[PDB]
């Protein structure tokens, strides 16, 4: 009994209907790094989404399924010059940047690229400060760069939706400096970070209302403007369910330790890289009266820090039963390794 | 310019010569999880090592290079029952355990296995408390289990070698309980945790001398007795040197630089997060007269804002297209890599010193 995933592609279809309802002005460019499974990319492409690609490999994968290059944005600010050459030769023209050094590379390798300036909000890693953006655009003008718009990324779990309003207002300032220096600014890219479980505390529908009101104030509708986003976990987090076998058991007031055949080097790498919190669900239906015991649950590797859950209340379980983990579609399969020889879970697909 | 490793296989030979001289009673069973490259396994097998394997895939791998199954120990205390059948159908008989529930599966799936009881020292995850070992062995007796020895693991970074003397003295107590109950106890396995950088603070040669003194007292030599260990980072940590290209650079006006390189925490530097590694960037350009140095950070190639390698280090001013080297990158590095964001792991090239 090897661990496996169930991927419900009909869940991705409903997320797409809700996006179009709450953000009808915004075309979504799915962040392929979140989950690059071939059926998930093929469902999203059948639905008419764009793709955000971050490397020569992702660009290769989305063309492979038929997607034309105009439905790709190459949204990595700091690109190896040979991956930029690969983008140009596949026909991908829209890329991001956030400093003058990157524009130097682009001038030598992809002179006609349509370039989008990312502003900070997110990171020390990426994002130009609004007070540096005049100097950057003056240098872009000297390098004959076709700057076409502005982008930002708030980050994947805020308690306020007000960060989106402030980023939109800052984006209009930087957008007007563009126009004043003579660039054709016509793209606003409001990035990613929307919740992918309909039971998050800060709901998708309130974030969207905040965004629509800031858009209406600072970017009124106009046929020369396109608004885009880069959602990843919003489309896929709740579509995948993981099942894992209990392969070993320890008993110690009573306490239990369960060992399962997937862990922090495999699918639960999201615990360390994505700060995920996960909840184990016995696959057996809750049966009357049941006693519940303090339990920890561990991955299969040699590593003492391969631990998935430290204290959760479970019934008493037996070797060979199954534990389920819901909402396991985002940043999970993509960061897996084969540490200690363990293999990653096969994926099986349903259509709701 | 893609990132790449250089692996010096003769550093692996010299580590083995140092091991034989400082621990001549101890046979090494290399921990394959640390670095499973095919040339590193082929070099160690040629030098006469055994193999510690933790999964069916590792066992397949080292048999595939021609290692017989008597030079394998299956040292994973909590095993999937179909991996236990796999080992039995491979001829692999020596395995570890640390509770009574694992012996119930063994008696149904591999009833003649030779079983080594692991005691705690290392983890909440693994190792039986020595106060439970009497009861564990009485149950092992009812399950008709051939218990043949004791193992422990101190863990890969003590500053005191005295944990090995306590572990060895605990191991002798549990060995005597085993003899008393009628088991034929003849293996002691002192586990892993030896430094692999000849200049880690607590030196190999000092840990060895503490071990040899504890062994001479509690485990005097005898033709029925074999002592074994399970070293991982010892043999490979300093053999691999990584080279990465600076692919992008930012400058802040105090002058500071940020450099972006084409391998990072989802790749070969996953050791920063899973193995607590601290790494040190070295320009491959030789240190040049008078050099002005600046406070610098160095970042991996992914989208993730937490993919950072170096937070503040003094480097000369670098240019896009130049190379940074990171030494001592052979342990827990290639084996924990993923292809997050599409980036691909570095090719390995080989030199024999």
């Amino acid at each position: 009994g090897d661990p496996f995933f169930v991927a419900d592609l009909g869940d991705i279809v409903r997320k797409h209907e809700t996006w179009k309802k709450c953000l009808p002005r915004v075309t979504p460019f799915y962040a392929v790094a979140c989950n690059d499974d071939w059926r998930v990319l093929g469902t999203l492409a059948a639905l008419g989404t764009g793709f955000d690609c971050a490397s020569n490999t992702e660009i290769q994968r989305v063309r492979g399924i038929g997607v034309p290059p105009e439905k790709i944005i190459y949204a990595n600010p700091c690109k190896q010059i040979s991956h930029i050459r690969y983008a140009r030769d596949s026909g991908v023209d829209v890329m991001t940047f956030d400093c003058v050094d990157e524009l130097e590379k682009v001038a030598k390798t992809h002179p006609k690229a349509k370039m989008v300036l990312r502003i900070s909000t997110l990171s020390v890693k990426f994002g130009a400060k609004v007070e540096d953006c005049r100097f950057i655009l003056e240098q872009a003008k000297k390098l004959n760069i076709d700057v076409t718009g502005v982008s930002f990324h708030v980050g994947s779990g805020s308690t306020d939706a007000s960060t989106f309003a402030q980023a939109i207002s800052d984006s209009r300032f930087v957008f007007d400096m563009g126009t004043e220096l003579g660039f054709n600014m016509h793209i606003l890219d409001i990035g990613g970070g929307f919740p992918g479980t309909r039971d998050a505390p800060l709901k998708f529908e309130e974030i969207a209302g905040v965004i629509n009101n800031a858009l209406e104030k600072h970017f009124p509708p106009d046929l020369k403007l396109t608004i885009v986003a880069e959602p990843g976990r919003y489309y896929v987090a709740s579509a995948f369910t993981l099942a894992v076998n209990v392969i070993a058991k320890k008993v110690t007031a009573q306490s239990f330790m369960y060992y399962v055949n997937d862990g922090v080097y495999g699918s639960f790498n999201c615990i360390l890289y994505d700060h995920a919190v996960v909840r184990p669900l016995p696959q057996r239906e809750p049966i009357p009266n049941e006693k519940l015991y303090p339990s920890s649950v561990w991955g299969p590797t040699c590593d003492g820090l391969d631990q998935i859950v430290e204290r959760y209340y479970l019934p008493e379980m037996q070797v060979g039963e199954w534990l389920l983990f819901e909402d396991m579609g985002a940043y999970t399969v993509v960061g897996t390794s084969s540490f200690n020889g363990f293999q990653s879970p096969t994926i099986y697909y349903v259509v709701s």
Side-chain angles (χ1 to χ4, degrees), chain A:
Chain A
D2 289 349
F4 67 92
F5 286 95
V6 184
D8 184 9
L9 309 182
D11 188 55
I12 298 163
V13 176
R14 284 196 298 288
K15 287 291 178 73
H16 188 60
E17 284 306 291
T18 304
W19 177 282
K20 300 186 304 150
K21 174 147 147 51
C22 304
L23 285 185
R25 288 185 73 189
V26 194
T27 300
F29 277 74
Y30 175 66
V32 342
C34 188
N35 191 135
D36 68 347
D37 175 274
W38 253 303
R39 258 66 207 308
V40 346
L41 299 174
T43 302
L44 280 156
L47 299 164
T49 258
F51 294 83
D52 161 30
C53 294
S55 63
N56 63 341
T57 309
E58 293 177 353
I59 286 157
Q60 285 205 46
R61 183 161 193 107
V62 323
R63 289 196 90 219
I65 64 160
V67 163
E70 320 84 46
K71 286 195 74 66
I72 302 189
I73 296 156
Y74 191 181
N76 171 177
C78 295
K79 295 164 291 308
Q80 180 173 143
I81 102 103
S82 67
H83 293 37
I84 300 176
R85 187 175 312 117
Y86 183 84
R88 175 202 66 211
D89 297 340
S90 322
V92 176
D93 296 330
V94 173
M95 310 183 287
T96 63
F97 63 113
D98 63 1
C99 69
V100 52
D101 326 90
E102 193 75 3
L103 294 179
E104 290 185 81
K105 281 189 270 178
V106 165
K108 289 36 157 198
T109 313
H110 200 153
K112 287 311 296 161
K114 276 105 79 138
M115 295 303 297
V116 178
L117 172 55
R118 182 172 170 177
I119 67 176
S120 68
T121 277
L122 135 272
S123 38
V124 38
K125 193 174 193 173
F126 291 119
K129 280 302 314 103
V130 340
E131 303 70 42
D132 301 337
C133 282
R134 181 160 298 280
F135 171 80
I136 312 175
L137 302 162
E138 295 180 332
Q139 307 284 91
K141 186 41 260 162
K142 307 171 170 168
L143 300 158
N144 201 40
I145 297 291
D146 194 5
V147 184
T148 42
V150 170
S151 83
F152 61 80
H153 187 253
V154 172
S156 319
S158 283
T159 60
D160 222 291
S162 66
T163 297
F164 280 93
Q166 165 191 193
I168 289 161
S169 138
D170 291 339
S171 297
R172 164 96 248 172
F173 196 120
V174 169
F175 213 86
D176 289 339
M177 301 167 220
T179 291
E180 166 204 340
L181 303 169
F183 297 106
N184 178 19
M185 298 305 279
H186 67 277
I187 295 165
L188 170 78
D189 179 344
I190 64 171
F194 312 99
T197 51
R198 289 166 208 100
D199 57 291
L202 179 53
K203 289 95 78 140
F204 179 66
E205 297 78 14
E206 37 190 326
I207 288 159
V210 173
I211 283 166
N212 284 150
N213 286 333
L215 251 20
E216 267 44 86
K217 170 183 132 139
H218 287 113
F219 288 90
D222 173 288
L223 303 165
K224 305 273 71 51
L225 165 78
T226 308
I227 324 273
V228 114
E230 298 165 359
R233 68 180 83 241
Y234 168 88
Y235 271 117
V236 299
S238 52
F240 283 55
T241 301
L242 171 68
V244 115
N245 208 68
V246 357
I247 65 176
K249 190 210 259 221
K250 290 183 193 181
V251 196
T252 97
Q254 171 108 141
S255 268
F256 294 106
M257 305 168 71
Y258 304 110
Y259 296 76
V260 291
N261 46 12
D262 197 359
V264 306
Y265 286 96
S267 295
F268 296 100
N269 81 93
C270 53
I271 286 168
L272 284 334
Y273 288 95
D274 192 42
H275 324 292
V277 279
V278 309
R279 301 293 156 51
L281 271 56
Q283 99 38 146
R284 301 184 334 207
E285 140 96 14
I287 226 64
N289 285 310
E290 75 312 287
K291 221 276 179 177
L292 255 50
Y293 307 89
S295 325
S296 55
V297 357
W298 300 82
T301 267
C302 47
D303 192 348
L305 274 18
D306 183 9
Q307 179 166 20
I308 283 161
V309 138
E310 223 277 273
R311 213 188 101 103
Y312 197 83
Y313 283 98
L314 287 185
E316 149 162 32
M317 308 279 313
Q318 301 304 316
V319 165
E321 302 180 309
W322 292 86
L323 288 162
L324 309 171
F325 297 82
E326 293 184 328
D327 297 338
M328 278 295 292
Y331 306 98
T332 46
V333 306
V334 296
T336 70
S337 78
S338 47
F339 192 68
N340 231 156
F342 288 111
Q343 330 286 221
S344 50
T346 312
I347 292 147
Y348 294 93
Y349 302 98
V350 60
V351 46
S352 264

mmCIF file of all heavy atoms in Angstrom, chain A residues 324-337:
data_model
loop_
_atom_site.group_PDB
_atom_site.id
_atom_site.type_symbol
_atom_site.label_atom_id
_atom_site.label_comp_id
_atom_site.label_asym_id
_atom_site.label_seq_id
_atom_site.Cartn_x
_atom_site.Cartn_y
_atom_site.Cartn_z
ATOM 1 N N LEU A 324 -5.709 10.530 5.714
ATOM 2 C CA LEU A 324 -5.922 11.416 4.574
ATOM 3 C C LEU A 324 -5.530 12.816 4.984
ATOM 4 O O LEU A 324 -5.584 13.189 6.147
ATOM 5 C CB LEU A 324 -7.348 11.519 4.076
ATOM 6 C CG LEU A 324 -8.122 10.212 3.785
ATOM 7 C CD1 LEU A 324 -9.583 10.650 3.535
ATOM 8 C CD2 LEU A 324 -7.528 9.421 2.636
ATOM 9 N N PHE A 325 -5.046 13.540 3.972
ATOM 10 C CA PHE A 325 -4.689 14.950 4.170
ATOM 11 C C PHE A 325 -5.233 15.743 2.980
ATOM 12 O O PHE A 325 -4.913 15.530 1.770
ATOM 13 C CB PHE A 325 -3.182 15.153 4.316
ATOM 14 C CG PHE A 325 -2.527 14.504 5.501
ATOM 15 C CD1 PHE A 325 -2.175 13.161 5.465
ATOM 16 C CD2 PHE A 325 -2.214 15.243 6.619
ATOM 17 C CE1 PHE A 325 -1.530 12.537 6.543
ATOM 18 C CE2 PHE A 325 -1.591 14.625 7.721
ATOM 19 C CZ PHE A 325 -1.286 13.280 7.681
ATOM 20 N N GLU A 326 -6.145 16.602 3.412
ATOM 21 C CA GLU A 326 -6.854 17.429 2.427
ATOM 22 C C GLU A 326 -6.063 18.711 2.106
ATOM 23 O O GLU A 326 -5.267 19.176 2.927
ATOM 24 C CB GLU A 326 -8.263 17.810 2.926
ATOM 25 C CG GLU A 326 -9.187 16.627 3.026
ATOM 26 C CD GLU A 326 -10.634 16.816 3.414
ATOM 27 O OE1 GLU A 326 -10.990 17.725 4.190
ATOM 28 O OE2 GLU A 326 -11.516 16.038 2.977
ATOM 29 N N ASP A 327 -6.460 19.342 0.998
ATOM 30 C CA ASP A 327 -5.914 20.687 0.680
ATOM 31 C C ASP A 327 -4.395 20.557 0.490
ATOM 32 O O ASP A 327 -3.660 21.331 1.057
ATOM 33 C CB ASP A 327 -6.289 21.675 1.756
ATOM 34 C CG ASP A 327 -7.779 21.944 1.930
ATOM 35 O OD1 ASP A 327 -8.535 21.701 0.963
ATOM 36 O OD2 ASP A 327 -8.212 22.388 3.020
ATOM 37 N N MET A 328 -3.964 19.622 -0.366
ATOM 38 C CA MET A 328 -2.529 19.275 -0.499
ATOM 39 C C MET A 328 -2.064 19.491 -1.926
ATOM 40 O O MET A 328 -1.156 18.827 -2.412
ATOM 41 C CB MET A 328 -2.273 17.867 0.014
ATOM 42 C CG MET A 328 -2.110 17.676 1.535
ATOM 43 S SD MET A 328 -0.655 18.470 2.277
ATOM 44 C CE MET A 328 0.646 17.460 1.538
ATOM 45 N N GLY A 329 -2.728 20.443 -2.657
ATOM 46 C CA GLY A 329 -2.417 20.726 -4.060
ATOM 47 C C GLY A 329 -1.368 21.800 -4.327
ATOM 48 O O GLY A 329 -0.698 21.794 -5.375
ATOM 49 N N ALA A 330 -1.053 22.640 -3.352
ATOM 50 C CA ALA A 330 -0.169 23.788 -3.599
ATOM 51 C C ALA A 330 1.208 23.674 -2.950
ATOM 52 O O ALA A 330 1.293 23.461 -1.721
ATOM 53 C CB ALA A 330 -0.855 25.073 -3.079
ATOM 54 N N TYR A 331 2.278 23.814 -3.751
ATOM 55 C CA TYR A 331 3.648 23.763 -3.247
ATOM 56 C C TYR A 331 3.957 22.420 -2.552
ATOM 57 O O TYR A 331 4.605 22.318 -1.496
ATOM 58 C CB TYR A 331 4.105 24.978 -2.348
ATOM 59 C CG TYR A 331 3.844 26.251 -3.141
ATOM 60 C CD1 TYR A 331 2.703 26.999 -2.912
ATOM 61 C CD2 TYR A 331 4.700 26.658 -4.148
ATOM 62 C CE1 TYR A 331 2.415 28.140 -3.651
ATOM 63 C CE2 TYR A 331 4.449 27.786 -4.932
ATOM 64 C CZ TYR A 331 3.271 28.470 -4.691
ATOM 65 O OH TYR A 331 2.943 29.564 -5.420
ATOM 66 N N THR A 332 3.450 21.333 -3.117
ATOM 67 C CA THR A 332 3.601 20.035 -2.412
ATOM 68 C C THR A 332 4.332 19.062 -3.341
ATOM 69 O O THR A 332 5.564 19.017 -3.171
ATOM 70 C CB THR A 332 2.286 19.364 -2.034
ATOM 71 O OG1 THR A 332 1.378 19.402 -3.160
ATOM 72 C CG2 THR A 332 1.659 19.994 -0.795
ATOM 73 N N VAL A 333 3.718 18.580 -4.401
ATOM 74 C CA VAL A 333 4.437 17.755 -5.404
ATOM 75 C C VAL A 333 5.675 18.376 -5.982
ATOM 76 O O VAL A 333 6.770 17.796 -6.192
ATOM 77 C CB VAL A 333 3.489 17.265 -6.538
ATOM 78 C CG1 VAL A 333 2.267 16.524 -5.934
ATOM 79 C CG2 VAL A 333 2.852 18.320 -7.429
ATOM 80 N N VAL A 334 5.696 19.662 -6.301
ATOM 81 C CA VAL A 334 6.791 20.380 -6.911
ATOM 82 C C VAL A 334 8.051 20.439 -6.032
ATOM 83 O O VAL A 334 9.135 20.750 -6.612
ATOM 84 C CB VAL A 334 6.327 21.818 -7.250
ATOM 85 C CG1 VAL A 334 5.206 21.739 -8.313
ATOM 86 C CG2 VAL A 334 5.709 22.585 -6.030
ATOM 87 N N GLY A 335 7.938 20.335 -4.712
ATOM 88 C CA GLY A 335 9.231 20.446 -3.937
ATOM 89 C C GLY A 335 9.738 19.111 -3.416
ATOM 90 O O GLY A 335 10.527 19.084 -2.436
ATOM 91 N N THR A 336 9.199 17.981 -3.936
ATOM 92 C CA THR A 336 9.559 16.657 -3.398
ATOM 93 C C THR A 336 10.944 16.196 -3.823
ATOM 94 O O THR A 336 11.515 16.619 -4.827
ATOM 95 C CB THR A 336 8.552 15.528 -3.772
ATOM 96 O OG1 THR A 336 8.743 15.333 -5.218
ATOM 97 C CG2 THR A 336 7.161 16.126 -3.664
ATOM 98 N N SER A 337 11.604 15.387 -2.978
ATOM 99 C CA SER A 337 12.880 14.798 -3.320
ATOM 100 C C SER A 337 12.868 13.275 -3.124
ATOM 101 O O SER A 337 11.915 12.785 -2.491
ATOM 102 C CB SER A 337 13.986 15.422 -2.436
ATOM 103 O OG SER A 337 13.933 14.818 -1.133
#
